Design a protein around this ligand. Structure first.
Ligand code: HEM
Ligand SMILES: CC1(C)[C@@H]2CC[C@@]1(C)C(=O)C2
Ligand SMILES: [K+]
Ligand SMILES: [K+]
Length: 406
């Protein structure tokens, strides 16, 4: 197929042609498809000839180790394929410490817990409002009726952007994580940057309370942040707010719709919701990006070459049986829930608190009003793989009579 010729320094015995954008066992579930990389005879570190050719760490131990060693594993070129990785200049993700820190502080300021607290009521209100509106219908296309609008509307509120632009922005964001082939990562990035620039210059004048104004008026390296730097950071924020929680919610709801027993557990023991959120985050982890070698380096007996790209699937750590016994089994009472769903190292997701709030509010408010629901009859759920994996569609059904209003 589209396999790049094996490079001279890469041993043939370490070859495993995994395609992160279309894994072979996708029909069994995306997490299950990636899990093949953790089967008995698969090395801890393999090389796939797919997507231009790149390494793939398959165990949590290596993934964590690599994300900690930024001196060897630089985030300068974090995306596969290389062309996308080279065009990827988002801030602060494309930067390594010490350079990353000043920009990371600003990014954290606009999506951190203090912001979540400020938005507590908006988040709560939107969830209840959306659910109450769907409740009497007895059915919904979950991905588009809730998974997308709930977190996206909250983010647009946070960023101070008009909801009218959602279709446009969500489309561009997806092209950077799960390209449909209509455009390159670079074209999508430039389109998003072009959307943001006029807004940034517009707000760079007066101090605002929205994320874009705060970024545009930030101070980094003892100077005002430039409009271009603000652009590089805001683009990252847009992608982070429009294509992460959105997909995770669908993996979680798909699971709940297929498991009455787990729905009942949370209905009867609501105090377990926080823990359930964490276990779902482990089992349905969905991100996978990587790093690039800054110099020749021997890692776990494997000769990595400067310029080599290495995928470090955040998704795989928690599915690693070496980290969690019976990894594919969802156990809300699981002891020592281990995962790197939000990343590891200096780039550990600063938006994870907003994410957990949206997930926990969804679990609480959905089960409170629509405790009983199932996958539409005859429906077969399809997943999609990429930098961020997702659910193509999730048709749900329920008897309106069983629903409750608050
Ligand atoms: C379930 C939801 C989420 C998941 C699984 C997730 C996952 C991740 C991961 C794996 C990284 C590190 C990537 C790397 O090391 O290259 C990251 C970075 C980041 N995330 Fe999230 N994220 C989520 C939600 C959010 C939300 C809601 C926002 C925005 C409002 C956000 C904003 C960011 C930002 C700004 C970074 C870059 C941090 C840096 O480079 O220092 N994330 N996220
Ligand atoms: C890997 C990510 C989840 C992280 C935030 C959005 C994302 C797709 C990036 O480009 C950095
Ligand atoms: K070789
Ligand atoms: K780059």
């Amino acid at each position: 197929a589209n396999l790049a010729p094996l490079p001279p320094h890469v041993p043939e015995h370490l070859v495993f042609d995994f395609d992160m954008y279309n894994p072979s066992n996708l029909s069994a579930g995306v997490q299950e498809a990636w899990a093949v990389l953790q089967e008995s005879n698969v090395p801890d570190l393999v090389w796939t000839r797919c997507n231009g050719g790149h390494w793939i760490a398959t165990r949590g131990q290596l993934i964590r180790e690599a994300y900690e060693d930024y001196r060897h594993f630089s985030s300068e070129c974090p995306f596969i394929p290389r062309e996308a990785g080279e065009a990827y200049d988002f801030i602060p993700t494309s930067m390594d410490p010490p350079e990353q820190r000043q920009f990371r502080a600003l990014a954290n300021q606009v999506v951190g817990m203090p912001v979540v607290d400020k938005l507590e009521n908006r988040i709560q209100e939107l969830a209840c409002s959306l659910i109450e509106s769907l409740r009497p219908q007895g059915q919904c296309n979950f991905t588009e009726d809730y998974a997308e609008p709930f977190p996206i509307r909250i983010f647009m509120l946070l960023a101070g952007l008009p909801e009218e632009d959602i279709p446009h922005l969500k489309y561009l964001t997806d092209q950077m994580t799960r390209p449909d082939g209509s455009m390159t990562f670079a074209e999508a990035k430039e389109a998003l940057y072009d959307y943001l620039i006029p807004i940034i210059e517009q707000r760079r004048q007066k101090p605002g309370t929205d994320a874009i104004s705060i970024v545009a008026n930030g101070q980094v390296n003892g100077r005002p942040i430039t409009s271009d730097e603000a652009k590089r950071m805001c683009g990252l924020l847009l992608v982070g707010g429009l294509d992460t929680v959105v997909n995770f919610l669908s993996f979680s709801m798909e699971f709940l719709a297929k498991s009455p027993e787990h729905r009942q557990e949370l209905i009867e023991r609501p105090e377990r919701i926080p823990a359930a959120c964490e276990e779902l985050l482990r089992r349905f982890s969905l991100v996978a990006d990587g790093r690039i070698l800054t110099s020749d380096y021997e890692f776990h007996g494997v000769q990595l070459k400067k310029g080599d790209q290495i995928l470090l699937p955040q998704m795989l750590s928690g599915l690693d049986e070496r980290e969690n016994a019976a990894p594919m089994h969802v156990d809300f009472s699981r002891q020592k829930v281990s995962h790197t769903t939000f990343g590891h190292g200096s780039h550990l997701c600063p938006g994870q608190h907003l994410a957990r709030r949206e997930i926990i509010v969804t679990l609480k408010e959905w089960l409170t009003r629509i405790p009983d629901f199932s996958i539409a009859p005859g429906a077969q759920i399809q997943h999609k793989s990429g930098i961020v994996s997702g659910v193509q569609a999730l048709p749900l059904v329920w008897d309106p009579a069983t629903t409750k209003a608050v």
